[PDB]
Amino acid sequence: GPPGPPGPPGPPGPPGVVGEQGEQGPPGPPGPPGPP
Amino acid sequence: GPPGPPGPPGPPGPPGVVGEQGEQGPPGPPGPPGPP
Amino acid sequence: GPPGPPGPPGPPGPPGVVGEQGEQGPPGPPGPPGPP
Amino acid sequence: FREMPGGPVWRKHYITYRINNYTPDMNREDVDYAIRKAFQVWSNVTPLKFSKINTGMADILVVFARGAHGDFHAFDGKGGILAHAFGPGSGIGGDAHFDEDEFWTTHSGGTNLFLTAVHEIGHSLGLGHSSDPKAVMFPTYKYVDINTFRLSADDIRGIQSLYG
Ligand SMILES: [Ca+2]
Ligand SMILES: [Ca+2]
Ligand SMILES: [Ca+2]
Ligand SMILES: [Zn+2]
Ligand SMILES: [Zn+2]
User: How close is the Cα of D86 to the center of ligand 1, in Å?
Assistant: First the structure.
């Protein structure tokens, strides 16, 4: 008997992994000089 | 009659989503003492 | 022949990226008062 | 893994982009310059040419949105997800979506649109990820002084494995 045609082109790949967590912000500049 | 071949491989998955934003930087040190 | 196996699973996608590095730290408070 | 798995690419060098809408966090000309410089980072190292258009269909749509926004990649308030791309291809393919609950910026404070757009346009070009903390296609953004920016060697290895 004649062999069949190919099956459908596969399920799409699962989504890529979620990112990890951001490095913390750089510390603030020292304040202005105090009142006289 | 004989079954057909396997289909082509699936499309690639979508890229991963961005992860948690970094936390706000530490506040700066108190400013220098007032002048004499 | 029958229309084949429905294809290999697609390649799972490339990941996220951690969310943007933390905010600028707030400038420190003004300094302590000068000497009486 | 510096290239998309299996890997979709653009089968032409002349690529187009459209900014769907602008973010209210920034000046209009600063959103423009962030995306223009983010495309220039990638055209420096391949045969690709990048052009902004103002009506009709583009290859790459740049979009600002919040929460659920019409694909299986819903955003999530301040922090968590800040963007998502899609790989090269028709329609939603190539498109770069950014989260509007985030505060977009030109500068080191807030959320630096140029640096984020380099990674998600990198996925709109078909990049995978690096495993090196020095790479822009690493699973970690770091803030770097945008005035002196460079790709890492493993990002150049990636994009030159897909184009040229
Ligand atoms: Ca598109
Ligand atoms: Ca978010
Ligand atoms: Ca915003
Ligand atoms: Zn990514
Ligand atoms: Zn989307």
Answer: 8
Which chains contact D through at least 3 pairs of Cβ atoms less than 8 Å apart?
Answer: A, B, C
DSSP D71: S
Give the chain A residue whose CA is nearest to the CA of C34: A36
Shortest distance between the Cα of A24 and any Cα of chain B, in A, equals: 5
How far lies D135's CA from each of D12, D18, D129, in Å?
26, 27, 9
Are the beta carbons of B28 and A31 closer than 8 angstroms? yes
Stated as kind and residue range, the H or E segment containing D18 is strand D14-19
D79 labelled ligand-binding: yes
Catalytic residue among D18, D38, D111, D120: D120
Answer whether D129 sits within 8 Å of C14, measured CB to CB. yes
Q: Let me know the angle formed at the C-alpha of D101 by D96 and D107, rounded to the nearest 5 degrees.
A: 75
Q: In this complex, is the C-beta atom of D140 within 8 Å of any C-beta atom belonging to chain A? A: yes
- Give the determination technique: NMR
Dmax (CA) for chain D in angstroms is 40
* Structural domain total, chain D: 1
Task: Give A17's contacts (C-beta < 8 A, 6+ positions apart).
Answer: B16, C15, C16, D139
Q: How far is C-alpha D92 from the chain's CA centre?
A: 14
- For D96, the 3-state DSSP assignment is strand
How far apart, in whole angstroms, are the C-alpha atoms of residue D157 and residue D164? Answer: 11
Q: How far is the CA of D89 from the centre of ligand 2 (A)?
A: 26
Q: Domain holding D76: CATH number?
A: 3.40.390.10
Q: D116-131 burial by CB neighbour count: b if 16+ within 10 A, else e?
A: bbbbbbbbbbbbbbbe
